[PDB]
Design a protein around this ligand. Structure first.
Ligand SMILES: Nc1ncnc2c1ncn2[C@@H]1O[C@H](COP(=O)(O)OP(=O)(O)O)[C@@H](O)[C@H]1O
Ligand code: ALF
Ligand SMILES: [Mg+2]
Length: 437
């Protein structure tokens, strides 16, 4: 049940199964008690969704705040994405009594920064309670869900799916959500389903949620991000039971390397994806593999990502980011990772005077570490040297291409390197120093 709230500031938790009502029934209850509530979610799709749903099912039309669209009603409940919250500068003084950090199991950099910011600023902004809500707290293991029938996929079916097969008869009619590990895999499966005469659509970042029909038969093939805390009224969920993790390798060549790999899903992912169905009614969950990997610590690369976002999108100095991240790591009941704040802080502290134009470009491009990418390009232009390669990651240097010659002043590795490398550049030495001492 939703924890009570006295005048004295407090941080509390809220654990309850998928689809039980943490994001809807709980804030509706606090409001009924006369409080002003802010509900922060990672997904813009789920956030926009709460607006029409609460109005139609809970007698209240809440305020909605997203980067692109804001809907002000003056209601005592506000739904916002962590990104919009951070972009507007954090906690608005005197605006809320209760702040719900929704989907706190999420380890994407925006949510980490967002929760850490709420933690560090809420009391000061006049709030009396902060709630850390999730159906999947640290160390949780997946258990049976009363509205979800789970059925293993087999080799019987005409659609190949991660070593298994999907029968067309199980997705022919009705609404279904199929999780794939990459955007490329979504496009490919959606294409095959369409070819077979089905109404399948792909949905991931870069795409508008309107591509999903609110009603009628449909097969949505998507990645995780936008599907967090989302209700699509799906008759079933089909899970590849596969994820894509990012990891930093201190390969000392000359500094560190950030790359991505495909891995079996953990307990958090299995429970959350399964929970897209069986929401308020019976549903079916089909899977490729049984069991699950334990839900443990997140990687240090995520911390690096927090400082990158702080510098590129939120106007946070590395010191300000450390304050917020420290609040997050010193709060019990949240995902944990090795303490490498001092390190990453020192690294970014030395990356000064970045080319504002290049940064704007990598940000608009949607790259993973727009700041490190843009800074490497900055270093290249300044030394009139070519980028590690001519992958789209380095496209902001194309116009300068005829003037770039010699080895690449490699600061770190964010992808394959093709050009000859040099490790004598100051910035490179600086990063090495951070890694050394
Ligand atoms: N956007 C929506 N459209 C239709 N129904 C919704 C929507 N959001 C929530 N619901 C309904 O209310 C229930 C609780 O949803 P929600 O609060 O999002 O769950 P959770 O506990 O995962 O946060 C769901 O089982 C679902 O039936
Ligand atoms: F726990 Al949820 F949508 F928030 F299933
Ligand atoms: Mg929720």
């Amino acid at each position: 049940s939703p924890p009570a709230v006295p005048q004295t500031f407090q941080v509390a938790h809220l654990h309850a199964p998928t689809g039980s009502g943490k994001s809807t029934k709980v804030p509706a209850a606090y409001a009924a008690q006369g409080y002003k509530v802010l509900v922060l979610n990672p997904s813009v799709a789920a956030t926009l969704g709460f607006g029409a749903y609460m109005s139609k099912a809970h007698g209240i039309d809440p305020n909605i705040r997203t980067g692109v669209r804001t809907i002000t009603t003056g209601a005592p409940i506000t739904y916002s994405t962590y990104g919009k919250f951070l972009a507007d500068g954090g906690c608005s003084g005197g605006a809320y009594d209760i702040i719900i950090c929704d989907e706190c199991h999420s380890t994407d950099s925006t949510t980490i920064l967002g929760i850490g910011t709420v933690l560090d600023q809420a009391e000061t902004a006049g709030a009396r309670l902060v709630v850390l809500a999730t159906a999947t707290p640290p160390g949780s293991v997946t258990v049976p869900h009363p509205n979800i029938e789970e059925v293993a996929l087999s080799s019987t079916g005409e659609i190949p799916f991660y070593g298994k097969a999907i029968p067309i008869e199980t997705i022919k009619g009705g609404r279904h959500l199929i999780f794939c590990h990459s955007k490329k895999k979504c496009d490919e499966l959606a294409a095959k389903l369409s070819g077979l005469g089905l109404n399948a659509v792909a949905y991931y970042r870069g795409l508008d949620v309107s591509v999903i029909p609110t009603s009628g038969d449909v097969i949505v093939v998507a990645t995780d991000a936008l599907m967090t805390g989302f209700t699509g009224d799906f008759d079933s969920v089909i899970d590849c039971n596969t994820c894509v993790t990012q990891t930093v390798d201190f390969s000392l060549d000359p500094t560190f390397t950030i790359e991505t790999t495909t891995v079996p899903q953990d307990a958090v992912s299995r429970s959350q994806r399964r929970g897209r169905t069986g929401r308020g009614r019976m549903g079916i969950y089909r899977f490729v593999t049984p069991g699950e990997r334990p839900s443990g610590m997140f990687d240090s690369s995520v911390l690096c990502e927090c400082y990158d976002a702080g510098c590129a999108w939120y106007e946070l100095t590395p010191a300000e980011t450390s304050v917020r991240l420290r609040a997050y790591l010193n709060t019990p009941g949240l995902p944990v990772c090795q303490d490498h704040l001092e390190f990453w802080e020192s690294v970014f502290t030395g990356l000064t005077h970045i080319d504002a134009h290049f940064l704007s470009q990598t940000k608009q491009a949607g790259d993973n570490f727009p700041y490190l990418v843009a800074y490497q390009a900055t270093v290249c232009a300044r030394a009139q040297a070519p980028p590690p390669s001519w992958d789209q990651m380095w496209k902001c240097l194309i116009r300068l291409k005829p003037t770039l010659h010699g080895p690449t002043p490699l600061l770190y590795r964010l992808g394959a390197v093709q050009n000859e490398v040099t490790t004598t550049h100051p910035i490179t030495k600086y990063i090495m120093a951070c890694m050394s001492a």
